[PDB]
A paper describes a structure:
Prions, the causative agent of TSEs, are composed of polymeric fibrillar assemblies of misfolded host-encoded cellular prion protein (PrPC) that propagate by fiber elongation and fission. Biologically distinct prion strains can, however, be serially propagated in identical hosts expressing the same PrPC and produce different disease phenotypes. Rungs of the fibrils are composed of single PrP monomers that fold to create distinct N-terminal and C-terminal lobes with the N-linked glycans and glycosylphosphatidylinositol (GPI) anchor projecting from the C-terminal lobe. In this study, we determined the near-atomic resolution cryo-EM structure of infectious, ex vivo mouse prion fibrils from the ME7 prion strain and compared this with the RML fibril structure.
ME7 prion rods were purified to ~99% purity with respect to total protein from the brain of terminally infected C57Bl/6 mice. Mass spectrometry analyses (provided in a Source Data file) showed that PK N-terminally truncates PrP monomers in ME7 rods at the same site as in RML rods, leaving PrP subunits predominantly starting at residue 89 and extending to the C-terminus with intact GPI anchor. The left-handed twist of the ME7 fibril is slightly slower than that of the RML fibril (approximately −0.54° versus −0.64° per rung, respectively), which results in a longer crossover distance (approximately 1,585 Å versus 1,344 Å, respectively).
Residue numbers in the entry:
A (entry chain C), B (entry chain A), C (entry chain B): 94 to 229
The structure:
Amino acid sequence: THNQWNKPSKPKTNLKHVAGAAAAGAVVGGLGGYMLGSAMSRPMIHFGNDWEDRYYRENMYRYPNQVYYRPVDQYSNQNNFVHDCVNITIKQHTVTTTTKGENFTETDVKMMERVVEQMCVTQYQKESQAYYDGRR
Amino acid sequence: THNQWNKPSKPKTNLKHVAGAAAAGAVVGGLGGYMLGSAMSRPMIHFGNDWEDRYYRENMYRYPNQVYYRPVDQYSNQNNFVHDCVNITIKQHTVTTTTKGENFTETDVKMMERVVEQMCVTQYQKESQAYYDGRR
Amino acid sequence: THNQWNKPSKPKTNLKHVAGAAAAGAVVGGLGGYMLGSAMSRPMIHFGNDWEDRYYRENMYRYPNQVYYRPVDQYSNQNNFVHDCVNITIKQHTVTTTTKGENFTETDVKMMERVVEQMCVTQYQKESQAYYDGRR
């Protein structure tokens, strides 16, 4: 004989942003031949009555990851790598408040001239040769 | 004999952004021959009576990942890589408030001249030769 | 003998953005021969009574992923890569408020001249030869 009763009264339940999996990653340049990991979300969430018996689950798992990097004659040049440039700013900022004023003069002057040439990420490369043969 | 009763009273239940799987990734340049991971979202959520018995599930799992990178003659040039450039800004900003004023003069003046040449991501490359043979 | 009763009272239930799978990925340049991961969303959400017995599911799973990168004579040039450029802005901004004013003068003056040449993503490449043979 097996009995299960579930009588919750006004069970307000919220599940926001639960069990999310995300496999990602940023790669700039490099010589390849690499492996990025996987993402697994496997939660068991239970409310109420759970009854289990005489089962056999989730056995004999294997996760063999192999990276075999065997180049023979590899010639490479890697120059001027950057990931990202964020929140570069130049500003002239004024905040003026006057709750109550009489017979007053306010003047705001903002000058910008020849402020900048480059703000970020200026990349220059002239002569790159992975293999150069200039004998004699 | 088996019995399952489920009598919740006003069970307000909310599930938002649950069990999402996202496989992604950004790659700039590189020499290839790589593997990015997968995303698995596998949650079990139960609100009530759960009864299981004499079952056999989720066995004999294998996840073999091989990256085999064997180039023989590889000549490569990689120059001037960037992922992204975000939130670059130049601004002249004024905020003026006058709740109550009499016989007043306000002046806002803004001049911008020759401010910038390149705000970001300027890439220049002149001479690249993966293999160069200039004998004699 | 088996019995299952499900008599919830006013069960307000909401499922929003549940069990979404998204396989994506951005690649700029590179030498190919890669593999991007997959997305699997496989949730089990149950309200009420669940009764399982003498079952056999989800066994003998294999996920063989192989990347085999074996070029022989690979010559390549990669120059001036960028993924994206976002939120580049130049602005002159003024916010003036006068809840109650009498006999006042307000002036807003904004000039822009020669402000910028390029905002972002300026790419220049002159001479690229994967294989160059200039013997004698």
